[PDB]
């Protein structure tokens, strides 16, 4: 099962997206792909900060009415159980000279709690969190 990090779901939306990432996303079974509520918040914030009004309005519509519905029932919250895993992962990394930022920590804890592999371009923090990861920029 996969938990898509913000940098992966955002790649296809770029002017010249990496074809390898797009193809990988196309090989996945939708029902097996999840999003953390944290990633949804970051996606929504990114859209709301666009400098081009026209683009923002259109992308807001597409995000809410076309993209997020693909994940209905699979937007995972950061709740009490995930909070426990978060503290465990971040403290362990810290007491072992590893680096994990809060944001990455939230995603990593969500994935561990649900037994998911994190898809992300930046695998560093997740390796330290001892959570499975996959970088779609690679084969």
């Amino acid at each position: 099962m996969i938990l898509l990090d913000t940098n992966v779901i955002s790649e296809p939306l770029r002017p010249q997206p990496n074809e390898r990432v797009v193809a990988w996303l196309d090989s996945l079974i939708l029902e097996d792909v999840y999003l953390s509520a944290i990633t949804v918040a970051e996606l929504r914030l990114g859209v709301a900060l666009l400098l081009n009004g026209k683009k923002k309005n259109v992308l807001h519509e597409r995000l809410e009415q076309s993209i997020l519905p693909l994940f209905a029932g699979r937007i995972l919250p950061f709740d009490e159980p995930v909070a426990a895993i978060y503290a465990q992962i971040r403290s362990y990394a810290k007491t072992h000279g590893k680096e994990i930022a809060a944001a990455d920590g939230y995603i990593a804890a969500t994935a561990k709690q649900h037994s998911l592999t994190v898809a992300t371009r930046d695998t560093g923090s997740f390796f330290a969190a001892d959570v499975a990861v996959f970088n779609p920029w690679h084969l």
Binding site: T6, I9, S10, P12, L13, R14, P15, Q16, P17, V21, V22, A23, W24, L25, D26, L28, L30, V33, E42, L43, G46, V47, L50, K55, V58, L59, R62, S66, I67, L70
Partner: peptide
């Protein structure tokens, strides 16, 4: 079905964005 293609299509109609 094809998640990547679905998203790439959105990016193209708006001209692309950096999220």
């Amino acid at each position: 079905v094809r998640l990547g293609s679905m998203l790439a299509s959105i990016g193209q109609e708006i001209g692309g964005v950096e999220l």
